[PDB]
Amino acid sequence: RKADLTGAVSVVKVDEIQKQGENNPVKALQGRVPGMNITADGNPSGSATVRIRGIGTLNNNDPLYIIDGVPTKAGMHELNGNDIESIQVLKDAASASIYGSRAANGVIIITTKQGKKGQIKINFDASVSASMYQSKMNVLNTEQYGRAMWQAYVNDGENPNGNALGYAYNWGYNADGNPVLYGMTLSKYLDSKNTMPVADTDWFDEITRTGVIQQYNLSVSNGSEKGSSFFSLGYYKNLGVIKDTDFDRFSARMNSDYKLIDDILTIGQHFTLNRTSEVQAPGGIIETALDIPSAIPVYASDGSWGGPVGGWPDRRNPRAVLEYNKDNRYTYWRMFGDAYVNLTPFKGFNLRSTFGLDYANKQARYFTYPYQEGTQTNNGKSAVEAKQEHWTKWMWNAIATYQLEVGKHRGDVMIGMELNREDDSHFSGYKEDFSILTPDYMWPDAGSGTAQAYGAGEGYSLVSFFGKMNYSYADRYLLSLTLRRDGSSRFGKNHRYATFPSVSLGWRITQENFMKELTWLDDLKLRASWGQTGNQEISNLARYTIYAPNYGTTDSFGGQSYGTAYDITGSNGGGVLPSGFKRNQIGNDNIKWETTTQTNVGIDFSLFKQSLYGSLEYYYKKATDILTEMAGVGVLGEGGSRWINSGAMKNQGFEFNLGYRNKTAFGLTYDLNGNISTYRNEILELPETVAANGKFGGNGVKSVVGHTYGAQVGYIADGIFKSQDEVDNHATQEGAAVGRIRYRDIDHNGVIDERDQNWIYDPTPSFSYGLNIYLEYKNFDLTMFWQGVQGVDIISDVKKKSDFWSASNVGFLNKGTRLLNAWSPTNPNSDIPALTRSDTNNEQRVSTYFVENGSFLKLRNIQLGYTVPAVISKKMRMDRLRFYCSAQNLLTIKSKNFTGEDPENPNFSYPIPVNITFGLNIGF
Amino acid sequence: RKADLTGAVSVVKVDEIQKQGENNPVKALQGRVPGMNITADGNPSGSATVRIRGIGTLNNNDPLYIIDGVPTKAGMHELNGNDIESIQVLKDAASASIYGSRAANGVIIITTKQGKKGQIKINFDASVSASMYQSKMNVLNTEQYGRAMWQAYVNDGENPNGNALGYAYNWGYNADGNPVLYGMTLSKYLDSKNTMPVADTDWFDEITRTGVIQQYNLSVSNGSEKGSSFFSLGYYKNLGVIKDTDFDRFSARMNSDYKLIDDILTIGQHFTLNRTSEVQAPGGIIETALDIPSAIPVYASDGSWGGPVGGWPDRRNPRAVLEYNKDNRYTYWRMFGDAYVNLTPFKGFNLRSTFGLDYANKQARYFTYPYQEGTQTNNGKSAVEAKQEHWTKWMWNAIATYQLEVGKHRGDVMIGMELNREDDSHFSGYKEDFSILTPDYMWPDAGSGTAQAYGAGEGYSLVSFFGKMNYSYADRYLLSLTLRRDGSSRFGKNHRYATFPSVSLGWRITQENFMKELTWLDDLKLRASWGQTGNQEISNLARYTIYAPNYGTTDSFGGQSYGTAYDITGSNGGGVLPSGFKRNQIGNDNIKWETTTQTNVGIDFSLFKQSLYGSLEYYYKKATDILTEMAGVGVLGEGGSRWINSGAMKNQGFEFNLGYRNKTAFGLTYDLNGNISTYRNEILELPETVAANGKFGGNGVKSVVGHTYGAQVGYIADGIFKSQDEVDNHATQEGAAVGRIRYRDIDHNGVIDERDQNWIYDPTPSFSYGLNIYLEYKNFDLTMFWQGVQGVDIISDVKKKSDFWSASNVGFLNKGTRLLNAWSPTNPNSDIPALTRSDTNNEQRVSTYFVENGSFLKLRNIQLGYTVPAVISKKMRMDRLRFYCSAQNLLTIKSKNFTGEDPENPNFSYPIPVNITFGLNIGF
Numbered sequence A, B: 001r002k003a004d005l006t007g008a009v010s011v012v013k014v015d016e017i018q019k020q021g022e023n024n025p026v027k028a029l030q031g032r033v034p035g036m037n038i039t040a041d042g043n044p045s046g047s048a049t050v051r052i053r054g055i056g057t058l059n060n061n062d063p064l065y066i067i068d069g070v071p072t073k074a075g076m077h078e079l080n081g082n083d084i085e086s087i088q089v090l091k092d093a094a095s096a097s098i099y100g101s102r103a104a105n106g107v108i109i110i111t112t113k114q115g116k117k118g119q120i121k122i123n124f125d126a127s128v129s130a131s132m133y134q135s136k137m138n139v140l141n142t143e144q145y146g147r148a149m150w151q152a153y154v155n156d157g158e159n160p161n162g163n164a165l166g167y168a169y170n171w172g173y174n175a176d177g178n179p180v181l182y183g184m185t186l187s188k189y190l191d192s193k194n195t196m197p198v199a200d201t202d203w204f205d206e207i208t209r210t211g212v213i214q215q216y217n218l219s220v221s222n223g224s225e226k227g228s229s230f231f232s233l234g235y236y237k238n239l240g241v242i243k244d245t246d247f248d249r250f251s252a253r254m255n256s257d258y259k260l261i262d263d264i265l266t267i268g269q270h271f272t273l274n275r276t277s278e279v280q281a282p283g284g285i286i287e288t289a290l291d292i293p294s295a296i297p298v299y300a301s302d303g304s305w306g307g308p309v310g311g312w313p314d315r316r317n318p319r320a321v322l323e324y325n326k327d328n329r330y331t332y333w334r335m336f337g338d339a340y341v342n343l344t345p346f347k348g349f350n351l352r353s354t355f356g357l358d359y360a361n362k363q364a365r366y367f368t369y370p371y372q373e374g375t376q377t378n379n380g381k382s383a384v385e386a387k388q389e390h391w392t393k394w395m396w397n398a399i400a401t402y403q404l405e406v407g408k409h410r411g412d413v414m415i416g417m418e419l420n421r422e423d424d425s426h427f428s429g430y431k432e433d434f435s436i437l438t439p440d441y442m443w444p445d446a447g448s449g450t451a452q453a454y455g456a457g458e459g460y461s462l463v464s465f466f467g468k469m470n471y472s473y474a475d476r477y478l479l480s481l482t483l484r485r486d487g488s489s490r491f492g493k494n495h496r497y498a499t500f501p502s503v504s505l506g507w508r509i510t511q512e513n514f515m516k517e518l519t520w521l522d523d524l525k526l527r528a529s530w531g532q533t534g535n536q537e538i539s540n541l542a543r544y545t546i547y548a549p550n551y552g553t554t555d556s557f558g559g560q561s562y563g564t565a566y567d568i569t570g571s572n573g574g575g576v577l578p579s580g581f582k583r584n585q586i587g588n589d590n591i592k593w594e595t596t597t598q599t600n601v602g603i604d605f606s607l608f609k610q611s612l613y614g615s616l617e618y619y620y621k622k623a624t625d626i627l628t629e630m631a632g633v634g635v636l637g638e639g640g641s642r643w644i645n646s647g648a649m650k651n652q653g654f655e656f657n658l659g660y661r662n663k664t665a666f667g668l669t670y671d672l673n674g675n676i677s678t679y680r681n682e683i684l685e686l687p688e689t690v691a692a693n694g695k696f697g698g699n700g701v702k703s704v705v706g707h708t709y710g711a712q713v714g715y716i717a718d719g720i721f722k723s724q725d726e727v728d729n730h731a732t733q734e735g736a737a738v739g740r741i742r743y744r745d746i747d748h749n750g751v752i753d754e755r756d757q758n759w760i761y762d763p764t765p766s767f768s769y770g771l772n773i774y775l776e777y778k779n780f781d782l783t784m785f786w787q788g789v790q791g792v793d794i795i796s797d798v799k800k801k802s803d804f805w806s807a808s809n810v811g812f813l814n815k816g817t818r819l820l821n822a823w824s825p826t827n828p829n830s831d832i833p834a835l836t837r838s839d840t841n842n843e844q845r846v847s848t849y850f851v852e853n854g855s856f857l858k859l860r861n862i863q864l865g866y867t868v869p870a871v872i873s874k875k876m877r878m879d880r881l882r883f884y885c886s887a888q889n890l891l892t893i894k895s896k897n898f899t900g901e902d903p904e905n906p907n908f909s910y911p912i913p914v915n916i917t918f919g920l921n922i923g924f
């Protein structure tokens, strides 16, 4: 049962959602909804990025979740998703407009479990899972690193014995004169102090482990004619594959409703409390682990943490970083409550007053221990940072609804007034100069150094007046008209309020009398919708020219703190220096709402006695007057960024969902759910400065206007130079040599320069598809979900340090194993460029070499279960007893062009592990 | 129905509690419970101090509240007391031992409302009240202040015109030579800059207002055979009489219970969330208002805040202080949840697992604005202090109970394991050097001055194993035996655990067959109890020798910060100075539990068909091995304080409760509830240093051992010297003169010295009584509650600055009106000493002059209500509709000896106002 019946509505089967056993219900529906992209890195929390109907705006694209009628934008990883009864996604502007003013990026409706009338039930779910690392990046060992360094040295013509890294090479020349390596030897200690012995260390294995996930839920519901109630307690814990990273969550949900005065009066409430404690991996931990060479031992001779010495590259120990970061635990309390009252003066009139509250508390204590890893140290810096953050959102809604059933005409008229208020604040203290260096002793009162205080606050408000009218004729013709008047505190008084209309039409062809003989065609409906929605998801202080007294107490990297504090006297400090103000941004009083117009056409069909159902959708989204933050022209200096309505986004998309469920003669019930979606995005208008800096694409070389959002311009790599004759024949370029990347001459001017660039990267897949198979046979239920993406290109940063030697910010870094298969006179059948120590050809530039085919098809979740027969369960008095074993991310298929692994996450972010889970469900 | 039936249990009628309309339910029962003292200053919050059975320990005496089986010690002002169904107070150690290990100071049982089976109900309560200031302290106006100053000057023999305060006196001598004042004149401006004009300002009226209190509660309950539920929403707001002080609170409570598996399994939960925002009055605001003379204007000539100039005393403007303190608003979130599960393997066995959580969050932002009030200023100091505090308590309880009903013998055997864990933390940031000086701009990131960070954390744990056995023979002989094994983390391993037994006996005389003819005697029961309880309410870090790195970042008054930071180089600062550690206290590994033995004897009677009921109780409490924090001997220096078991407290008390309810021929129902209680406290053992410093009494002159706790030693004032002959006849003393206080010579040595002191102050009332009258007549209900205290002495600090001139730390301060009635040759019929400018006689010493009779009798709450007749309510479909008007603290009677006002609060704390309230109750 769709709650709109005339728009693009996707209903998610919650039974399959809980089968995957994911903490975040959103992450479970990664590819089960057409026109919906869910990206998850794989960290222990269920945090993920959601994109509905592609990218339709230049500001934040987070969709507006709605739970029990309360809107929000926070992630669902911090909420208990196991007590969800129904999930509805509103991807159409006309359908989602009536649910709030923040429906620009789509609306997701989440309904919590409630006690069913006339029965009382309980459900206890237990789940234990083991997570194993699968995308183990292959890196060179000590011998492989030495061989690669020797190959680079001999390719560059330098003496390999002058590496000054403890490597002694016994090598010679073959008959053809190509250098050949016979053997290598290493000094026992990398330094002259004999404190860092050489060893073969698997850093990826050292920093990874086998995580343990435990989930325990207990829900009880009780219904009655005078009311109903529901109480759920949930516990979740996930240990990440990366060491010293974990996330656990307690959840308590209480829902109830009461009917008084012979069903005239109703009072209901839905409340939930969550407590999530998490230790997160440090930024770029995978990058640090990959960069550090395997020759560095984990522990030194004296038992201290190992580190680079002498000429080894300046890379911190990933194991020591994880050990020091294990105490950076943050606690998050989530408060999601709602109380509603409903009154019915007569049969057709309803008045609902609803109050919703969302209170978020975050407390963190970050520690900075003194470390000395060889030549890497922080000069004995020890510090503590105690941070507190508060978020408070409250919403009040007044709804008046009238329904009439006169003749064959059904008419619903609803009006509503909504008020939203959000207030955010944060404050933190910083202390230094500790002695014991333990979490127990590291408190700000126990410090003896410089102390700093930080603190900020902000907020906004929303006012909405909405009206919805629905007309139904003969249960065959449906018309919907809605109007919205929305205002926000982020705009000036002149442009505070804006009006948004939406219209929807629907015709049930199967109800027409001219096809009564079509018994096979059970149902057929054609619907169209044209709607307008408003977007204002911008900075709260957007229309004000912001001047702030940035003294310079905030930590900055590279010294570009831009603080305002100068020793005008010239006493080299010693006190409070004079301060001032700096401009953060230039205000603009002409900013207004961003108008997104959505046109949707849908065909819903159901054939063979409601067995073969499906829907086909075509949508066109056009966003104009987009509030974009343009940067300064260059001479305007600091604070030149300002918000302006100079954007234009276009999205043309197709979606197709199909489902076929049927039994079998011998007792097998098979249900197949197929889904496919495609979309095309385009940028039509953009400010000149934004197109020049290329923040939305183009890399600052060409304007992204007229091209897909996120498209990147780069060079074209036409293979590599296999001979000097090839170098001479090709157009002249800087750094051209044998074994180097050959760049195509686009304009045929005879020289390779900055103008030989074209559009090479397009982050738009050809189509994303999903397939869910459910089989029931003799109390055995098997679930199998496949998700695939075809026609998508990906930029691989791992390739930059796996296909080249010394292609990073620093040299002598550890590289990938496939680097051993580089081009050489001995091995001419290779496409990887020859190893070198100097990047004369400048191979770090953006080109088609780093663009790979991201197409993949992976088994997201497979589950085999056994249900106890009813007679045994009744003998044990149990209503239901089930067991199941599942595998998540067990198998995947990638393209041959993709040289790396894990096409979903081809970057240095958190890896995606394989989960093996065993679970039980009891229905006492 | 008492939940112990064999111990000292007080049942509080909740219907009368809600009649008073107080935010704190505890404050409502100020004198309705025998042997229970409730002290409330009168601030907008319902904060109050509770003492059960007198003072029985030298450490914190706060009783252990229990709500829904969850123990706590936080005040009930932050919780919603309007949803309470029953209140039980356990003042006996034997009865309260089984409810927790913190029952040393008594246990209060609070039960929340639950849905009654088979019905569904709603109650809406509205209340609007006005609070008016009644205890307006009388202070001298400009003319009265000038007259008093002239009288003091002429009494001291100095020239009154040399006061240098702008007062010019035209005065002369009478026939007898006594000076007489004819007239006075004042300069228009108190300063030479003509910026502070003279005016007659009523500071008490200026800083006080008429407060408004609003209360709105809405509760709904629904019961069924399969479970029950209850949901309550409450809002309270109180504006204090002192300006810029207020307290509001939102409360949401959800209770539910479910019965599954044919009543074998039960799952229940009780949860409440509270949000209290409060701005409190600054410390000593009443004292500051009284001290400042009335001649100081509220506003200066230029419109700025007025302040003293020239020779006027250094007193800050109370109105300006209140105006600057209005932004010191703190927010407090309270989380009180509990979930329990019960299983019955068969008829007589029960297993209960209960988990309770108490989470408290406090966020405050204190502002320090730059002020310049005449000569009073802070050198333009502006600062912000952002403080965050977290408290987290969690308790787990496992209870196994068995009941047998064999023959005439009833046997209950219960065992239980309880675990408690409390963790507290706090951190704050401090910033300075602000420019705009508004709450919006005052944030730590916006500051430009020195920043400080403070932070601390602590906690403790409790483990308890308890067993209770109850035996009943013929429903006539009752025996109870309980044993407790309690351990805490605050002690060492050797003395971690302690054992506490308790025994109770009871005999129902009315059940004996030898008095079957006593029809009038409906019921008579004699009970006795002897129990032992453990007390460990001490500092968490009590057994450790504490060394802390107190750098000196904490604000201190007078410069005694005791920080550890010295400029050993001698560069006058300019950086981080070297620091160290200091000893806070000396540890003691021999500390153990404090053992309190309570012996109670009770007689419960009920006569005339359960119409005249009552109870008489006698209790003896003996606390030994009391954990007291003794100070250093004097040469031990800092950190000499340590915890030791060297205390002994004795309490002998009597209580009597009576109640008579009866109807009348013409239709009047009268219920009278009388209560009386008395107690005597004594200290038997105490450490020598504690007795020497006199922290528990004696004022450091004589040991408090063998005397009542809090007793004070002082001189004896035998009137005043009315002539020189009286001075000559009396024993010689320093400062003796005509009109000065005469001090009795106790030892008859002929000279008044420090040894002429005796016990003068005893803070033990002779008896405290209460009387509640409830009258019902023709739908009119009248409630009248009187509370009286007799035989209590009070030390009046107001007298020190109302009966003397220049008796404070500084001179020329405003004094009371009664100071005008001082002794003089013109007015010899007076007991107030003659005015003087020099305290040669040293009248500031503790003496019987400042000891007054604190006996009082006040109408705590009177309420007249009208209930709509049932037929009209049914016509309007309402189940109940009632209105009421009430007065709180309307009338009081004091003793003639008490020269001041408000005997309950005779100090400079928050005043107690008169409340006039109108309320309505609706039962839809």
Ligand SMILES: OC[C@H]1O[C@@](CO)(OC[C@H]2O[C@@](CO)(OC[C@H]3O[C@@](CO)(OC[C@H]4O[C@](O)(CO)[C@@H](O)[C@@H]4O)[C@@H](O)[C@@H]3O)[C@@H](O)[C@@H]2O)[C@@H](O)[C@@H]1O
Pocket: A047, A073, A074, A075, A076, A078, A280, A332, A362, A389
């Ligand atoms: O600084 C960028 C870098 O650091 C992070 C934190 O690791 O961001 C710092 C700030 O992000 C905040 C502000 O909301 O929250 C993000 C983290 O807190 C969590 C807790 O659940 O999310 C809070 C809440 O806000 C979102 O993150 C945004 O809508 C939602 O996803 C979520 O519901 C957690 O998910 C985030 O890690 C604030 O807490 C930090 O000060 C990272 O975000 C980023 O990588």
Ligand SMILES: OC[C@H]1O[C@@](CO)(OC[C@H]2O[C@@](CO)(OC[C@H]3O[C@@](CO)(OC[C@H]4O[C@](O)(CO)[C@@H](O)[C@@H]4O)[C@@H](O)[C@@H]3O)[C@@H](O)[C@@H]2O)[C@@H](O)[C@@H]1O
Pocket: B047, B073, B074, B075, B078, B280, B332, B362
């Ligand atoms: O410094 C003494 C003087 O100042 C007060 C605050 O005005 O105490 C200062 C510190 O007391 C703290 C520590 O708990 O709380 C007291 C105030 O906060 C409130 C908020 O509801 O109470 C908090 C919580 O702790 C109790 O006070 C003790 O168990 C409980 O009553 C209550 O549940 C509020 O009631 C108090 O005013 C801390 O907040 C301050 O830093 C006063 O206590 C005292 O007069």
Ligand SMILES: [Mg+2]
Pocket: A745, A746, A747, A748, A749, A750, A751, A752, A753, A755, A756
């Ligand atoms: Mg070219």
Ligand SMILES: [Mg+2]
Pocket: B745, B746, B747, B748, B749, B750, B751, B752, B753, B755, B756
């Ligand atoms: Mg003497």
